[PDB]
Design a protein that fits this description.
252 residues; alpha/beta; 2 domains; five-stranded mixed sheet; two-stranded antiparallel ribbon; 13 helices; ParB domain protein nuclease; hydrolase; ParB-N
């Protein structure tokens, strides 16, 4: 992978062009007032991240705040690549500057992590097709035709977080297995509405797959599946064995 280079410069605040995808990459959080006073008191401590053509990659909230605070010019890091052609590079920057961020809870960074890894996967299926064994058996098909195994996806995760500063070894493997084998289940961990813990979601996975009822659970009606999963009360029914009879009933 080519090395990323950039230069530090100051530009008119209106010179920055926004990319609606990058604008919505990072899950909404409660950090606005945080970097609102930072910019209020001591102005710009950190520069924003832009590409060669001044397309904003990272710093959409910060830019919005500064626009409203009268700021006329903003310090940036202009990287020497075209985000519209080398998206993969923009994707990496957004992860680098957000995955470790503390203002983001574990579930919001996981949702970002997946959003990133999914992008990188398509970026590699468009190059390879143009220019543990068990884990390599299962595959998922993204909304573009890009298919991939739990193994490849997991290796992609590691590449994005080698020093495990964002997640742990087992967390990346748990997430990878869920992402490929049971996407509908991962969404519960990713959904802002639920923020179901990963490790808890994975316990449900291994559990329901031992009972041979992975598909019954997946095919359950939302009215029944949501409460059974997004609630601690519901998980007991799935996890604690003294509730087998109830579970079998819920299933059908």
């Amino acid at each position: 992978m080519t090395e990323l280079t950039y230069t530090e410069e100051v530009v008119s605040i209106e010179k920055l062009k926004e990319d609606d995808e990058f604008k919505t990459m990072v899950p909404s959080n409660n950090s606005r007032e945080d970097l609102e006073k930072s910019l209020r008191e001591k102005s710009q401590i950190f520069p924003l991240i832009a590409d060669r053509n001044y397309v904003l990659i990272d710093g959409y909230t910060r830019l919005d705040i500064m626009k409203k605070l009268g700021f006329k010019e903003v310090k940036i890091l202009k990287y020497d690549f075209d985000s519209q052609q080398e998206r993969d590079k923009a994707y990496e920057l957004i992860w680098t500057f957000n995955g470790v961020r503390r203002q983001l809870d574990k579930n919001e960074r996981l949702a970002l992590f997946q959003k990133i890894a999914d992008r990188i996967a398509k970026m590699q299926a468009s190059k390879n097709k143009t220019e543990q064994i068990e884990e390599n058996e299962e595959f998922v098909t993204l909304d573009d035709g890009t298919t991939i195994s739990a193994l490849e996806y997991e290796r992609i995760l590691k590449e994005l977080d080698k020093e495990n500063k964002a997640l742990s070894e087992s967390d990346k493997r748990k997430m990878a297995i869920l992402r490929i084998n049971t996407p509908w289940l991962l969404k519960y961990v990713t959904d802002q509405k639920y923020k179901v813990p990963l490790d808890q979601a994975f316990r449900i996975y291994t559990r329901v797959k031992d009972m041979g009822i992975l598909d019954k659970l997946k095919d359950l009606a939302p009215a029944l599946r949501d409460p059974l999963i997004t609630t601690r009360e519901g998980r007991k029914i799935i996890l604690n064995d003294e509730y087998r009879d109830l579970m079998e009933k819920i299933i059908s």
